Every structure is written in structure tokens, then in C-alpha cells.
């Protein structure tokens, strides 16, 4: 019942962020939810003296037919004080399930100097009413300080389960609990539900989301294996190798661009000389080796680039320095979005963010192949994670598109 | 009959700053006479109070004679305290748009004048509202006052007032959901679909409910009768519009004529269909000096005449019906200009609007159409809480070809083709693979950074060549110029090979119109073509063709 001394960063003020417009269906759901939350004291109405505001909206889960309130605490997170060395074993795991233990936060009350900074607004259609304002009394789902404060109060709940299973890795990030065990699914499903009645003993706590870090998309860069090479094939190849030379050292393209000597038709077949095939093979060997001196620095930002490859395919690379990829991958399994580009890009951003949380314990900043105004209008309609990453936009077509497929 | 106290709002100053101390100005003898009569009166009403010598804060007060009233009027210069008062969540950050209202049988205005001064002020904040009335001949201590209610012209008075009024109106709204209420400034707008008899009783029910807090309403059948004039609009029982839009017709148009013609026709474009302002707003771009006169172009005067004929007749919009579908229809007007009408039943506009392309070197019709849709979509979430169905001048196969091939993700909500020309189309489309049996042009260009001299040309697999020398050019112009020559001197199908990452970036963006004189010529060439495959190779690697023409143009 006693609070924790929370404070912002030096010189920074609370967030003043405009609420963006919401559809009628979402306004209605936020009202129903915030009424039940008000009766339970988790939130209380506020007046005009509170000038701070953080956006709010509503989402539907993958299969939960009940809405959920999602507060965009990104601005407050940038302004909340810094308060766990990330479990580097979680990524080596074979199966990981993620649970929303967000309800657990609503039992610890929040520092009363800090509550004014958690202000949000339910808006009205056409501004025919003033917005219903609340501020949080308990810990808020989405705020950086919620897992930090609660982890002293959360280690105790699961140490009987940790005592029973030293094999199982458990990692906490925001309102999500990542639970990992290297065993068959039948044991998993009951072990995960066993982990709930152990959590139900004290206090949407029922959903399950299943990942497989071991069998994940991790890729190299590959050159084609052809028998007859056109001028165009060898040209694309020299372009790929020229771009890979910024990444790997011993890449050579001289004996290959030697074949391009002359002004032949793009569709004309060029037999490869042996100096050329020696060069192409040595480059192929080089590319299978990893990038040299590539390391993760927790002080720096993780950057993620996504390219649209067509036919529901998407390539991405996570890095901190240009040409020092910490991870690359490809996606073609974009769910239920076969005629919507923005739904695919939204689902890909969440998958990449999820993979980034497992590996490094924090989320990347995205460079999205989409125009600012299209993304900002629609990403909330398909967003299903309880966290939100940062993003910027690329307006010039990168030539790296077909280098990665 | 006892009244309820209105809960006060705890106010503080911006942290780090203190209250205001600016000096009291010298007033004429008659001005001092008036302020004493007003402030003596207001003290009787409980709105202000005398204070002692301890309070060191001072806000200056003036006296303004009314136009034809011999009743003076007080005025406190709260500008200094407003710089020091904290920030509030202004609940007026958005006003409704007439197109989103639901048609009501009856609508009554209620004027809440003295309600503003019925609202208490936080006790611990009253110290900063202090002000002095300078005495006659500066021979006594100027009598000192402080406010006990929300003062006129104070930063936080609008916010605290509307939040208190909202708190009081919520029980009424709850216990009769057949009545909607809107509050702005000093006015209450109250309406319903009730039998006009029951409506007035519920008005009285509200007026008595207001006195429960000691709030006074206009007893009289009020003089404000439709049309309600409000925030530049005119609102009638079955239709709305803007307060009249008549154009200044002049021969000499200054710079403070154009910037204010900007603000007006934009305001008028929400209901007046088809208003354009591209060439006219394009005049302002340069200077801030507020007196210059400009000659318009022959496309800015020809556009203004197409305005006036839209504005000869009054136009009106319909109110919103939640059970009929919502529809938006867009038309291209040329020169990066678009107009849209939003309606539910054909020819009955809820509202209209325009969209102008953003500033950029190269552009595309399809992207502009997409941008316009997002603007209408966001605008419709605000006013109606839903996305309209779109009727767009673009065919389903054009859009499908576009978004499946474009390098960015893009999306339009539910829409259908409407055959109202000019139609948005794809003017050209590049190949994914090299074309068999098509001549292959290796192009290159190069310029001398000093003399601005350069060459541009091509070599092909059929031995065809060209090199052209140029003056006052850059590397990027010659790389474009070379591609232009290959398009000029080739058949209906052509394979182009280039090393210009800059040129590829422009053409892979698929522009159909450009500010660059040279890019437009290339677009015109691509339109004539049947199949064009554009291929990229890295420079200075000795790629044949590229190596040969690079040497010819660098020489
Ligand atoms: C009661 C209100 C929300 C309302 C109005 C009032 C407007 C006045 C200006 C600011 C925004 C609210 N109006 C406009 O009045 C037209 C009218 C209707 C019936 C009788 C007399 C006048 C509306 O039209 N609806 O539907 C309405 O529902
Ligand atoms: Mg060159």
C-alpha cells in the first residue's frame, strides 16, 4: 500500500501530447473499460489544473473478443527516470510463451506526485462533449516504471516455481512475461497453465502466444548458382558483390566485371571464364563467414530497416552501425493481410520488435518503407502488442531491395 | 433555498516564477471615480474583497469608455499574471463542425452571463489577482482588492469555468438522455427531438437545476433566433453554412490582401465546392514585409474567376444521420489540386473540401490521391467517428498494379471507381526483367566541377552511339541527360543501363510530373514507350559499355 519515490529526469516536464482521433467503436470500448476501472479505484477523474496528457486508444487481441486499453506512454517513458542484465540464455531457448501479466500491476498503487504525469483523455466524436480525463492511481500498463517497481514485488511470486524448475528461463518486459522451456509442447501447455494458477493464487491473464527462438529466421547473404549467365545476371551479381564489399573484406569483382567487357545485349549469355569462377567461389566462401567485429552495445539504439519485396514478402535487418548487422530476416507469413500492405507492415513491426525483446531486452527504432501520413492514419487499426516502438520514414527507394532477395 | 458550493480548482503558478508586481498606472480623475463605483458594487456581490498592506502583488486596472454607454467598464491587464499562471488542459482544444450534428426538432440557446462570476477561485491563488485603484490626487493609500471568482481575461478562467459547468450538467444529461447540450463561451445550446411542448418543460427542468447551484438563466424567450451565428458559421434548423463569403474585387492586390484571401477561401472551401488556391497561395512564398503589391499570373486570375462563379449563389450543407452510409467523392482539378464532397444521399453535401499537394521536386497523381484520402479519413474520424466509403477517379486495375508494384507500403480503405474524368492513371511502367530483342543502351554522363562543362551519351549492342557536349551542367544533369538521349533514339522497347544511383532514385519513385524541366522530358519519353527496363551497375568497376561511355564523357 506504500508507494515508491518516482521522479522524472532533470529539467524535463511531464508529457503534453495531443490525443489523436478515435472511431466510435473505440471511444465506446474505452468508456466501458474506464468506467469499470474507475469503480475499482485504478483511475480517477481529473480537472483542468492537470496540463499533462498521454494518448490512449483501444485494440483487439489476436483472439480475445474483448477490447483492451493501450496507453501510448512513449513520451512519459522518455522522461521517466532510469531505474536487469538481460538473460542472454532466453534466445538460445527452444520454446517461449508470452503472457500479459499486466493486471498484476493494478494492485500496487502509484506515487502521488507522479500520478499527474499519467493523465490521458477519452475524446468525444466531433468534440460535442469535453474529453473524459483520468489519471492513474495504480501502476499503468505500458509505463517503463511499472515492471521496475513491481519486480521486487514479482520475484517473490515465482520463486516457488523457479525452485521447482531451474531449467525454465523467465524474462519480464513491460506487461509481458516471456517463459521459456526446452521440451515438448504437451508439457509446455500445462506448465504454462500451471504457471497461471500459481499466479492466480495471488490476484486478460489467460492467453497464450508461442515462439521458437531456436528455429527462427536468421539469414546469410547468397549469390545465385547458375549454369548460363546473361549479361544482366552478371551485372546484378557485380552490384550485389560491390555492396557486400562494404561489409566483408576480401571481396573481388575484377575477374567478373572482366566478362562484361564489351557492349553486349542484356539477355546475351556469357560463358564464365575460370578466373571468374575462382573469384565467384572465393566470394561465396567469404560470405558464409560472419561479419567481423560486430557487437551489441547496450548504450546505443537498435535500428531496424524493412524492405517490401512483393507477394507478401518482407526483408529486414537489425543493426546499430551501418553495415554491422546484428541480425537479418525475411517474412512471408503475414497473417490475414493478403490485400493490405499496411496490415502486413504493422504485423512485421511487431514480430521484429518481439524478436528484439527476446534477444536484447529492448526494442529497436524502425525505418519504415511507407509515407508518414499513411502509416500514422492506420497502424492503430492492426496493432496488437501492448508496447509501442519508435519509428521514422524512408521516402527514397533504397537500392538494397533486391540485394536482400 | 440553499445553493451548493462549486468545488474550487487548485491553481498554482509556474514553478520557479513568482507572482506579478507591475506598477499601477496613473488614471484620470473621472476614471478613478468610475472604478470605485464598480468595485464598491462588485464587493457587495462577493466577487472581490478589500485587502491589507501585506499582499505585495499588483495587476494594473484601466477604465474604457463604452461606445455610447455612459456606464464605464473596468479592465484588468492580467497579461503579466497569465505569463506566470500554470498551464491548463484547455477543454476547448476542439470545437464541433456543423456537418457532424444530428438534426434536432428544437434547439434553444441559454446565455450564462453571470455564471462566469458565480464560480469561486482557489483561495491560495487569490493573492496574485490583487490590484490597486489609485486614489484622488495620490493622497490616500490606493484601495486594494483581490478577486474571489474567475476574473475576465485570466488565463485559466475558460478552463475552470467549462469543467465546472460540465460537472453540473452531467447529472442532468444522465437523468434525461433525450437531450443534448453544448457549451461554448457564455452560451448553452440545448436541443432535442421532443414534442415541442415537452421540450420547454425540460428547458425549465434545466433552468431550475441550474439554480440548484445559484446560476441565473435568461428567463425571456431569447432574442437569438435561427440562424445561430457561431465561430464564423450560420446554423439553421435543417442546414448550415458560413457567414457570407463575398470577394474583394480590386485592381491592385497587396500582400496583406493575399494572405487574408488565403484564410478566407480555405474557410469557404469547406462548403463551397471546387475552390482552388494553388497559383494564388503560390504568390506569398517569399517576403514578410506587409505592404507589397504583386501582379498575379494569367493562371491565378483565370483561377480566381472560376472562384467567383462558385460564390454567386449561397450553398448549404446537410446535418448527419447515423443510420445512412457516409460517402466521400474526390475529383482531380489539375496542378496538384483536388476537391472532395462528403455526403450520405446524392447531391446533399454534408461538407466539402480541397487538398493541395505537398512541396516537392517530383510528384505523382496516385500518391496525391492517396494523400487526399488520408486527409479525408482523418477528418471523418474527427467529425463522424467513422471512415466514409470513397468514390475515386481511378480504376481498380490501375490501383492494383500500383500498390502491388510500388516499393512502399500503401493502402486505401473501402472505395469504388467513379467514372468522372480526368482519371488518375499510370502513364508508364517499368519492366522487371531485361527485354529480349530490345536494343541495350549503356548511358553515362560527366561534368567538370570548375567549368560546368560536361558530356552525355550512350553506346548500344548494335554499335549505335552518341555523345553530346553540354555547358553549365552538373554530374546529376548529365546522368539524366544521357538517359534522355537513350529514350530519344530508341525503338518502342529499350533496355537502359546506367550507373547513376541518383537517376535511378528519381525514376524508381515513378514520377509523372516534375519541377525539373529535364525530368519531365524523360517522363514524356517513357510515355511514348511500350517496354522500358532500367538496370543499374556500379561505376568505375570497368563494366563494359559503362566503361566505354564513361571514358567518352569524362574526356
Ligand atoms: C444542440 C446542438 C448540439 C445542435 C445544434 C447547436 C449548435 C450551435 C452552434 C455550435 C454547435 C452546436 N445545431 C445547430 O442549430 C440548428 C437548429 C436546429 C433546430 C432548431 C433550431 C436550430 C443542430 O443543428 N443540431 O442538430 C444539434 O444537435
Ligand atoms: Mg561515370
Swiss-Prot record, chain B:
Changing residue 441 to L: No effect on cleavage between p51 RT and p15. Changing residue 443 to K: Almost complete loss of virion production. Changing residue 168 to A: 71% loss of DNA-directed DNA polymerase activity. 61% loss of RNA-directed DNA polymerase activity. Changing residue 280 to S: 21% loss of polymerase activity. 16% loss of RNase H activity. Changing residue 56 to G: 64% loss of polymerase activity. 57% loss of RNase H activity. Changing residue 440 to S: Almost complete loss of virion production. The record marks 402, 415 as: Essential for RT p66/p51 heterodimerization. Mg(2+) 2 binds at residues 444, 479, 499, 550. Changing residue 402 to A: Almost complete loss of RT p66/p51 heterodimerization. Complete loss of polymerase activity. Changing residue 187 to N: Loss of pyrophosphorolysis (reverse of the polymerase reaction). No effect on RNase H activity. The record marks 441-442 as: Cleavage. Changing residue 304 to S: 59% loss of polymerase activity. 8% loss of RNase H activity. It is found in: Virion. Heterodimer of p66 RT and p51 RT (RT p66/p51). Heterodimerization of RT is essential for DNA polymerase activity. The overall folding of the subdomains is similar in p66 RT and p51 RT but the spatial arrangements of the subdomains are dramatically different. This is Reverse transcriptase/ribonuclease H. It comes from Human immunodeficiency virus type 1 group M subtype B (isolate BH10) (HIV-1). The gene is gag-pol.
